[PDB]
Amino acid sequence: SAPTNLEQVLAAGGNTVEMLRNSQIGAYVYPVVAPEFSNWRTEQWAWRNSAVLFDQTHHMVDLYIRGKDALKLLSDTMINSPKGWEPNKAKQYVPVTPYGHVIGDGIIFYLAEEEFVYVGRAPAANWLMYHAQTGGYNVDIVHDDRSPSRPMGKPVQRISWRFQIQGPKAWDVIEKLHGGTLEKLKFFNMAEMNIAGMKIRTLRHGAPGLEIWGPYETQEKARNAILEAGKEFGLIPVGSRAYPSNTLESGWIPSPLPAIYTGDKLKAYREWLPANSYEASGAIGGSFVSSNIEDYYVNPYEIGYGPFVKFDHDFIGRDALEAIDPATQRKKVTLAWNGDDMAKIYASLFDTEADAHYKFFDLPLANYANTNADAVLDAAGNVVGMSMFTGYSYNEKRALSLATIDHEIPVGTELTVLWGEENGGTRKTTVEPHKQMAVRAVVSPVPYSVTARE
Amino acid sequence: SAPTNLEQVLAAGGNTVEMLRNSQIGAYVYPVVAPEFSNWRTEQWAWRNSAVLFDQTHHMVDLYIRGKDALKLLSDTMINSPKGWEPNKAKQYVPVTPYGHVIGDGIIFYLAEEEFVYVGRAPAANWLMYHAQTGGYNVDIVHDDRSPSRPMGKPVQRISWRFQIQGPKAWDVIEKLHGGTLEKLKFFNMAEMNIAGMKIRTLRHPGLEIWGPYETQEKARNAILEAGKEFGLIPVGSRAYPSNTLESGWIPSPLPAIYTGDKLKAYREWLPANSYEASGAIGGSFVSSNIEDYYVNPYEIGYGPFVKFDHDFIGRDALEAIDPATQRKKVTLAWNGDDMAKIYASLFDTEADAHYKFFDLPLANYANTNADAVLDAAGNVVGMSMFTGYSYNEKRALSLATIDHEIPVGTELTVLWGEENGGTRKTTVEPHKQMAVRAVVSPVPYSVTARETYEGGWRK
Ligand SMILES: Nc1nc2c(c(=O)[nH]1)N[C@@H](CNc1ccc(C(=O)N[C@@H](CCC(=O)O)C(=O)O)cc1)CN2
Numbered sequence: 001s002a003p004t005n006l007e008q009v010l011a012a013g014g015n016t017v018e019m020l021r022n023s024q025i026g027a028y029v030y031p032v033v034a035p036e037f038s039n040w041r042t043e044q045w046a047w048r049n050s051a052v053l054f055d056q057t058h059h060m061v062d063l064y065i066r067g068k069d070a071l072k073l074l075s076d077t078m079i080n081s082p083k084g085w086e087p088n089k090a091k092q093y094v095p096v097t098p099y100g101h102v103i104g105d106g107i108i109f110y111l112a113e114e115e116f117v118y119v120g121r122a123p124a125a126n127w128l129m130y131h132a133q134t135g136g137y138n139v140d141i142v143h144d145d146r147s148p149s150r151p152m153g154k155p156v157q158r159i160s161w162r163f164q165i166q167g168p169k170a171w172d173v174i175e176k177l178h179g180g181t182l183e184k185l186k187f188f189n190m191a192e193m194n195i196a197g198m199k200i201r202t203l204r205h206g207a208p209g210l211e212i213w214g215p216y217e218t219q220e221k222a223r224n225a226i227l228e229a230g231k232e233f234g235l236i237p238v239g240s241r242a243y244p245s246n247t248l249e250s251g252w253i254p255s256p257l258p259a260i261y262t263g264d265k266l267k268a269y270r271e272w273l274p275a276n277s278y279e280a281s282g283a284i285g286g287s288f289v290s291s292n293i294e295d296y297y298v299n300p301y302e303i304g305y306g307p308f309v310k311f312d313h314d315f316i317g318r319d320a321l322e323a324i325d326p327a328t329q330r331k332k333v334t335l336a337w338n339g340d341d342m343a344k345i346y347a348s349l350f351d352t353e354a355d356a357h358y359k360f361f362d363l364p365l366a367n368y369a370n371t372n373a374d375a376v377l378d379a380a381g382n383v384v385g386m387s388m389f390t391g392y393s394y395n396e397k398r399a400l401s402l403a404t405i406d407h408e409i410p411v412g413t414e415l416t417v418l419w420g421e422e423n424g425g426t427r428k429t430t431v432e433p434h435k436q437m438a439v440r441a442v443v444s445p446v447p448y449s450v451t452a453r454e
Numbered sequence: 455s456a457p458t459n460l461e462q463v464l465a466a467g468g469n470t471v472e473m474l475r476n477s478q479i480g481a482y483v484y485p486v487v488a489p490e491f492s493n494w495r496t497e498q499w500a501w502r503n504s505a506v507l508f509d510q511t512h513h514m515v516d517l518y519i520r521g522k523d524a525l526k527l528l529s530d531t532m533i534n535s536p537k538g539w540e541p542n543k544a545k546q547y548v549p550v551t552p553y554g555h556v557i558g559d560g561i562i563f564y565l566a567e568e569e570f571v572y573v574g575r576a577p578a579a580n581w582l583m584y585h586a587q588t589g590g591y592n593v594d595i596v597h598d599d600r601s602p603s604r605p606m607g608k609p610v611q612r613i614s615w616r617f618q619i620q621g622p623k624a625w626d627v628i629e630k631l632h633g634g635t636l637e638k639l640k641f642f643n644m645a646e647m648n649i650a651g652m653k654i655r656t657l658r659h660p661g662l663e664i665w666g667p668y669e670t671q672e673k674a675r676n677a678i679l680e681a682g683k684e685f686g687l688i689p690v691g692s693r694a695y696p697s698n699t700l701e702s703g704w705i706p707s708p709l710p711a712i713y714t715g716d717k718l719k720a721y722r723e724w725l726p727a728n729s730y731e732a733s734g735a736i737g738g739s740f741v742s743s744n745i746e747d748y749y750v751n752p753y754e755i756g757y758g759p760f761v762k763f764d765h766d767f768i769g770r771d772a773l774e775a776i777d778p779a780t781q782r783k784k785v786t787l788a789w790n791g792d793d794m795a796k797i798y799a800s801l802f803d804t805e806a807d808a809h810y811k812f813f814d815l816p817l818a819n820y821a822n823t824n825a826d827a828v829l830d831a832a833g834n835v836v837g838m839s840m841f842t843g844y845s846y847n848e849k850r851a852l853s854l855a856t857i858d859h860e861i862p863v864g865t866e867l868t869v870l871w872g873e874e875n876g877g878t879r880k881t882t883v884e885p886h887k888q889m890a891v892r893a894v895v896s897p898v899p900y901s902v903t904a905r906e907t908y909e910g911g912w913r914k
């Protein structure tokens with residue numbers, strides 16, 4: 001009969017990389033929220049120059065974790081130190097496999113004693129649920145999936161609404177809503193604020209700003225209050241088209257491949273994951289090609305989570321991470337793509353004589369799979385890194401990507417990103433026929449700041 | 455107190471053009487349907503090379519018109535001849551004002567005796583509703599609005615679902631669903647077909663438009679996609695969908711020519727203050743302080759052949775007085791690909807004070823009425839470009855325009871792309887500078903035309 005878990009899918013599908021690079025899943029969608037409210041350029045501009053409302057209600061998985069062993073479950077599975085962790089502090093939860101590779105990540109809120117909520121993409125939520133169900137933990141779990149990618153006019157519901165108020169004028173909007181001064185608490189500390197007489201819990205995700213959430217039913221009331229108060233300061237809502245491009249400027253890589261496709265110690269997990277999970281059904285896109293799925297894995301140090309690793313508690317993969325030498329690991333950078341090469345990519349769309357054009361680079365977000373992997377090359381043609389999230393900033397007037405590259409490459413080095421896939425493109429439904437191009441890219445800081453080439 | 459009709463809005467709103475060109479309404483949205491199912495390039499390609507399912511359920515107003523005087527109401531307001539019109543034939547309804555200017559258009563289905571339904575944009579439905587109410591007609595009307603632009607996850611409902619199966623393999627898919635041979639009905643005649651045991655009414659567009667009660671939408675959709683998989687049929691999302699008309703030649707967006715004239719004052723005093731006409735937007739480079747310079751008459755947008763003086767109709771006297779031979783003509787403008795490359799290159803220029811107006815793909819409109827000036831080599835306004843985007847099938851940017859009648863096919867003109875002084879206050883407009891784009895006058899529906907050279911560029 002047909003598979004019911006990921007292990008059976010892999011045992012049937014041939015080479016794992018070939019299966020994922022030709023998946024028919026289609027685009028990774030940021031659902032439900034209007035694609036644009038004004039236009040994505042003005043919306044990008046506003047978060048740097050005035051204020052914005054980000055609507056985060058629909059594109060992330062929420063996992064509510066309650067019970068006596070809830071903290072134990074988190075401690076056992078995260079690289080992060082649990083020491084001194086008290087309610088009203090959030091952490092960027094990063095779990096690794098027994099082999100030291102990143103499964104995923106999200107934000108875990110310590111809400112009350114024995115009460116936590118994870119927010120992020122599916123993979124780290126899947127890992128938490130597996131260990132909660134099979135590891136003998138005394139916990140209760142409520143899974144609230146991200147909203148359907150194409151709801152078709154059907155109704156949509158979540159447990160909570162989730163917004164951010166950001167931009168240089170964000171604190172003015174927040175204080176106007178609050179009705180008084182509000183202390184700028186420390187990064188990732190949680191407090192509360194008033195909105196139209198409601199007690200609204202907050203998270204410092206600062207130009208300071210806040211993330212706020214509440215029961216789904218008060219979404220419109222909260223939203224209307226924020227937009228009305230924000231008008232004086234030029235606050236505008238951001239649509240789903242501009243929304244995900246924000247991370248190109250801030251430097252968080254959303255899309256590491258869940259490193260769970262190989263390894264005897266991960267087999268029981270592969271047998272637990274359903275055949276229609278994110279991990280079985282998703283796609284890999286881009287120019288980086290290897291026949292071994294392990295070559296797509298990253299460890300925490302390679303994508304900026306090195307400083308989170310704390311060998312002060314027992315956790316899955318701790319021995320693997322202790323054996324890593326942090327000083328030689330690849331490092332997360334921003335690649336600043338050459339504007340002349342970008343013009344050449346778009347020009348090929350309007351070339352009526354050419355046999356092929358370069359891969360369409362959508363704006364402001366150019367990803368065409370849920371895991372992105374473009375090869376980064378030096379001037380000799382060696383593969384020196386992997387570019388993992390790609391798009392464009394109207395603030396910078398530059399195409400940008402987030403990448404992990406060999407540690408010895410200095411800031412300001414001109415590399416190339418291989419943009420597009422081989423042999424006319426894979427069979428992904430996001431991929432039109434196209435030829436590859438080497439794009440020149442200057443290694444830049446993360447978060448992005450402008451860098452001289454030299 | 456909020457106003458309740460358009461005349462109040464105009465009397466308080468300053469210059470009418472300035473009001474409409476700075477409207478805060480935002481984008482003209484094709485709502486509800488997923489923006490993409492595969493990607494818009496493959497979707498465009500499939501309607502010329504395999505088969506597609508267009509989903510038309512949500513972006514048009516439906517106006518059902520029933521009763522003894524239903525046909526008389528249509529005949530009294532359309533330029534079209536009613537002769538030979540009987541149930542199971544559709545027409546492209548085109549009403550003009552008493553001054554001979556186009557209000558709008560859409561398809562009217564003659565469903566049965568005394569039973570009609572109009573499908574299209576709001577303006578012609580509004581006009582029909584006004585005359586149904588004030589003209590002394592024995593008719594009942596049911597208005598079913600297009601879906602909200604941003605439903606916010608709230609549920610949506612229409613009276614009917616409405617699809618098209620199109621492309622070179624469309625009839626193969628149609629017959630596989632039918633269970634046998636199906637006759638190629640004549641253009642715009644209506645019949646029926648089988649879909650999953652249901653009797654589905656059809657309209658000939660070489661493919662079909664089909665419709666049915668809203669509750670059977672997913673049953674119909676699933677059967678179409680399942681049967682079409684054999685022939686490479688795929689669904690088209692809302693991003694690619696509206697660019698189809700760039701290739702086929704229909705201008706969707708004439709300005710409803712109702713803003714001036716004493717004979718239209720009573721209509722303005724009835725139109726709601728939040729109507730399409732009151733709240734919408736005009737975008738583009740064509741600038742005049744006189745709203746009437748944005749009006750078109752039916753000859754200018756391809757509807758000249760529809761005008762028949764065999765019946766009484768609003769605007770008959772005005773249209774009689776027009777010389778069809780001296781009127782502007784509908785064409786396709788093929789935009790120069792090097793000028794397009796330059797438009798997109800400016801987005802990646804970190805040093806320029808300004809960039810050219812963003813050209814979204816595959817549809818570039820940023821208002822519900824579009825009006826870009828078309829210029830000759832001397833800079834005379836010789837036309838108006840009215841719908842703009844790009845075809846992956848042609849690897850070309852295209853616009854639909856109406857231009858001076860004497861301008862030959864193959865002539866190179868320019869379209870002024872973008873707005874003046876950094877751009878209007880429309881929420882779709884980022885700061886930008888204008889660019890003159892070279893464009894070759896081509897036939898409609900579009901076909902590739904060789905450029906024709908003149909002494910120092912075509913002028914006059
Ligand atoms: N609900 C919520 N969940 C989320 C996101 C969100 O937006 N809100 N966005 C994603 C997480 N993105 C980031 C980006 C940056 C940081 C960050 O800045 N972390 C600190 C360390 C945090 C810690 O001490 O644990 C640092 O110094 O890098 C954290 C999550 C996924 N899940």
Ligand SMILES: Nc1nc2c(c(=O)[nH]1)N[C@@H](CNc1ccc(C(=O)N[C@@H](CCC(=O)O)C(=O)O)cc1)CN2
Pocket residue numbers: 510514534544545546547559560561573574575642663704
């Ligand atoms: N439901 C439905 N309604 C619609 C559209 C649709 O897609 N389906 N699309 C829009 C109308 N578009 C066209 C395009 C071409 C023609 C057309 O081809 N007309 C014939 C004449 C038809 C007649 O005899 O009156 C001609 O010779 O030009 C008609 C409507 C709006 N209304």
